[PDB]
Amino acid sequence: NFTVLQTIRQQQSTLNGSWVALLQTRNTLNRAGIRYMMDQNNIGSGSTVAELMESASISLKQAEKNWADYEALPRDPRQSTAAAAEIKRNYDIYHNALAELIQLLGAGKINEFFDQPTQGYQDGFEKQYVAYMEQNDRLHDIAVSDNNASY
Amino acid sequence: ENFTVLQTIRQQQSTLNGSWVALLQTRNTLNRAGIRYMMDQNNIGSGSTVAELMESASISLKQAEKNWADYEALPRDPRQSTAAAAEIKRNYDIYHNALAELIQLLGAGKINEFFDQPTQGYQDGFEKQYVAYMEQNDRLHDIAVSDNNAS
Numbered sequence: 001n002f003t004v005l006q007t008i009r010q011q012q013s014t015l016n017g018s019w020v021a022l023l024q025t026r027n028t029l030n031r032a033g034i035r036y037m038m039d040q041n042n043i044g045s046g047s048t049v050a051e052l053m054e055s056a057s058i059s060l061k062q063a064e065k066n067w068a069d070y071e072a073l074p075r076d077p078r079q080s081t082a083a084a085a086e087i088k089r090n091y092d093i094y095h096n097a098l099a100e101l102i103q104l105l106g107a108g109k110i111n112e113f114f115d116q117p118t119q120g121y122q123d124g125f126e127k128q129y130v131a132y133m134e135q136n137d138r139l140h141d142i143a144v145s146d147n148n149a150s151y
Numbered sequence: 152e153n154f155t156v157l158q159t160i161r162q163q164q165s166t167l168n169g170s171w172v173a174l175l176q177t178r179n180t181l182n183r184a185g186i187r188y189m190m191d192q193n194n195i196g197s198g199s200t201v202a203e204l205m206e207s208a209s210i211s212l213k214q215a216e217k218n219w220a221d222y223e224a225l226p227r228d229p230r231q232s233t234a235a236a237a238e239i240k241r242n243y244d245i246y247h248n249a250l251a252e253l254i255q256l257l258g259a260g261k262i263n264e265f266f267d268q269p270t271q272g273y274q275d276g277f278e279k280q281y282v283a284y285m286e287q288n289d290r291l292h293d294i295a296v297s298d299n300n301a302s
Contacts, residue, residue: 002300016168023175030182034266037189045266114186115197 001147004076008136014070015087019129021063022094026118028056029101033110049105056102060095067091078139087128094121153299156228160288160295163225167239170218171281173211174246178270180208181253188262205257212250219243228291235287239280246277 032052038044075084097118104113184204190196227236249270256265 020172020175023172023179027175027179027182030179030186031266031271033186034182034189037186038263038266041189041193043263045263046271110186111190111195111197114183114190 001143001150004078004143005140007073007076008140011070011073012133012136014066014073015129015132017066018063018070018091019125021059021066022098022122022125025056025060025063025098026101026122028052028059029098029105032056032105033113036105036108036110053102053106060098060102063095063098067095076139078142080135083132083135087125087132090121090125090128094118094125097121153295156295157292159225159228160292163222164285164288166218166222166225167281167284170215170222170243171278173215173218174250174274174277177208177212177215177250178253178274180204180211181250181257184208184257185262185265188257188260192262201257205254208250208254212247215247219247230291232287235280235284239277239284242273242277242280246273249273 029052031047032049035044035047035052036049039049071088075081097116101113101116101118104110104116183199184201187196187199187201187204191201223240227233249268253265253268253270256268
């Protein structure tokens with residue numbers, strides 16, 4: 001009881017961070033596509049393309065890592081192994097186009113990149129992430145429900 | 152009592168999160184429109200037009216205010232800092248506005264200052280309190296759960 005509650009909650013904790021980090025990564029990568037762009041009309045504001053890249057790396061790995069602390073969180077006998085497997089592959093697709101994005105940029109061909117239906121992968125993840133959360137909020141209360149009762 | 156303090160903290164945390172997440176998606180979508188533009192003004196133009204990109208930014212942004220509003224409407228706990236709540240709201244207002252402007256700043260098409268706004272600054276400005284509010288609240292939750300478990 002008392003214990004299935006930090007687990008499920010360190011899982012949220014951890015999965016949110018990953019979520020946010022992928023999102024910060026996407027937006028950064030997008031300020032690179034932006035500045036590589038004025039950088040081709042021989043202009044450029046704020047920061048070099050390049051720092052956005054590395055800043056794009058530091059965050060994707062912060063993302064890759066938060067995701068690892070999650071996975072390493074041990075599942076309650078009550079959590080669907082199919083559920084977990086579903087968010088993970090959506091996390092895997094999203095994540096990957098993100099990684100693939102960067103490359104596209106370093107490879108400089110910028111039309112191949114704006115066209116990656118990243119929105120589709122992100123959403124694919126957003127859904128499971130919420131479904132997951134819902135699954136966990138429900139389990140969570142279910143536990144609180146047997147304790148506060150059994151007490 | 153502890154239901155009262157936990158069905159609510161868990162609730163400020165989730166509402167506040169969706170909003171935080173809607174601010175990033177909006178920022179991101181704004182940069183995709185940013186790119187789309189140059190590509191449109193220059194020669195080649197891949198994917199989603201500028202206008203579609205720009206009203207999503209507009210929708211997801213509203214999505215942010217709604218979550219902020221759901222958050223605010225949440226009755227505060229007596230031990231929750233009221234300067235914390237006001238400091239987050241302040242960073243939320245400036246970041247939120249930083250983005251509401253980037254937009255028309257785009258209908259106005261000057262794609263130049265657009266990339267120049269200290270947005271990256273206003274964000275961690277926000278992301279900085281959002282995280283302390285989270286910190287303080289979590290910490291308020293353990294403490295919280297300890298009194299009733301104490302009784």
